[PDB]
Structure 1
Amino acid sequence: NEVIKEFDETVSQMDKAELEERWRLAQAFNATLKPSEILDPFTSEYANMLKVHERIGYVEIPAIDQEIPMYVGTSEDILQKGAGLLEGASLPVGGENTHTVITAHRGLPTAELFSQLDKMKKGDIFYLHVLDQVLAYQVDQIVTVEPNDFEPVLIQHGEDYATLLTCTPYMINSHRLLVRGKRIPYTAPI
């Protein structure tokens, strides 16, 4: 809402060369990221090039009428206000051999957040708005796993993936719902 408008307003006032340089720095990070143990979020400075007044963009999910601001990390402060980029995952700038993981609560009293993520189906398309770029991902896999069974958020060579992660069943939170999309061609209108 206000936060998303503010983000896009700020970006539109930024220097084209700086936007380009920031983007390449994110790509460099994604090109050199080593596999690491990725923990369940519910129970740094490395993304600084993406930060615009602490936000790194937003995730747009037309299937559930959501546009949710994104931040770095999964602390409770972050998750009370938007979605968080998971520690150890790729930055949300795409590229071959990348897998970004974006997490949000299955609803809060005053924001639906990922409450309706269970409504998403294979073929649905969601969009990551990062700096002045918009990256489209099409849902190709939906699984629910125990917090201990987290292999599906790992980097797969040759692919460009983005997973939306929340808790499930609603209010029972015994498991995690992972909605995986694969990059499809899309560029924001100029």
Structure 2
Amino acid sequence: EVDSPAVRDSVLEAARQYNTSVVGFPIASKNSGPYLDYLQQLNPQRAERPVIASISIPTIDAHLPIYHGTDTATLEHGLGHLYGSALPVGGTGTHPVITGHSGLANATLFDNLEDVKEHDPIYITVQGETLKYEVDAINVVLPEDTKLLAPDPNKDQITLITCTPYAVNSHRLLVRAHRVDLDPNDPNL
């Protein structure tokens, strides 16, 4: 059964193993061996567009699916995981980058990522498990300025990225967060 603890445990372990192979950060033929392996991760049901994880950001009332990659069509319907960053299964040394659109008239998506503040919680649910992160940095940068996406071998971090669609020139909003302990009774779960 896809939802069994045995399967979920194996899929999580497989994704942690995949993550050991991620050595840079994003600064790809979908037929390459590594991209094909990426697409098999977090997808024991072997579906074509699986939801790999979901994210909750209660301070902006956002609850959204995350998919593999950053195809145009994907980002009209949810969040994209940036290939070349770790999959969002936690671990010291990992730095998943999760992207979403702002401004699309029919879908809120990351429209309000700009209203997230320092210390706000972010919850990632993946293969039945929930990981809690807390916001520690908020930066608006030029789209080529990607230094802040680097992994740090002693931290378990994530960055959520969106565009600044009201600005005349293109920029990116980067909201960085670090792993924290999860209270089992946390209201938000």
Q: What is the TM-score normalised by the length of structure 2?
A: 0.85
Taking the aligned partners of 1:62 and 1:23, their CA distance within structure 2 comes to: 25
Q: 1:172 to 1:64 in 2, by over 3 A?
A: farther
Letter in 1 for 2:116: M
Taking the aligned partners of 1:173 and 1:164, their CA distance within structure 2 comes to: 20
Q: 1:188 to 1:89 in 2, by over 3 A?
A: farther
Letter in 1 for 2:179: R
Taking the aligned partners of 1:35 and 1:79, their CA distance within structure 2 comes to: 23
Query: Could you tell me whether the CA contact under 8 Å between 2:85 and 2:95 is conserved in 1?
Result: yes
Q: 1:181 to 1:173 in 2, by over 3 A?
A: farther
Runs of 4+ aligned structure 1 residues displaced above 2 Å come to 169-173, 187-190
Name the Cα RMSD after superposition.
Answer: 2.0
Find 1:129's aligned residue among 116, 125, 129. 125
Partner of 2:20: 31
Query: Could you tell me whether the CA contact under 8 Å between 2:82 and 2:98 is conserved in 1?
Result: yes
Paired residues, what number? 174
Taking the aligned partners of 1:178 and 1:157, their CA distance within structure 2 comes to: 20
Alpha-carbon shift at residue 34 of structure 1 (Å) = 1.8
Partner of 1:157: 153
Q: 1:135 to 1:169 in 2, by over 3 A?
A: same
2:118 matches 1:116: no
Q: 1:90 to 1:173 in 2, by over 3 A?
A: farther
Which stretches in structure 2 are left out of the alignment for 5+ residues?
A: 28-34
Taking the aligned partners of 1:170 and 1:66, their CA distance within structure 2 comes to: 20
Counting aligned pairs with the same residue, the percent is 37
2:74 matches 1:78: yes
Taking the aligned partners of 2:4 and 2:158, their CA distance within structure 1 comes to: 28
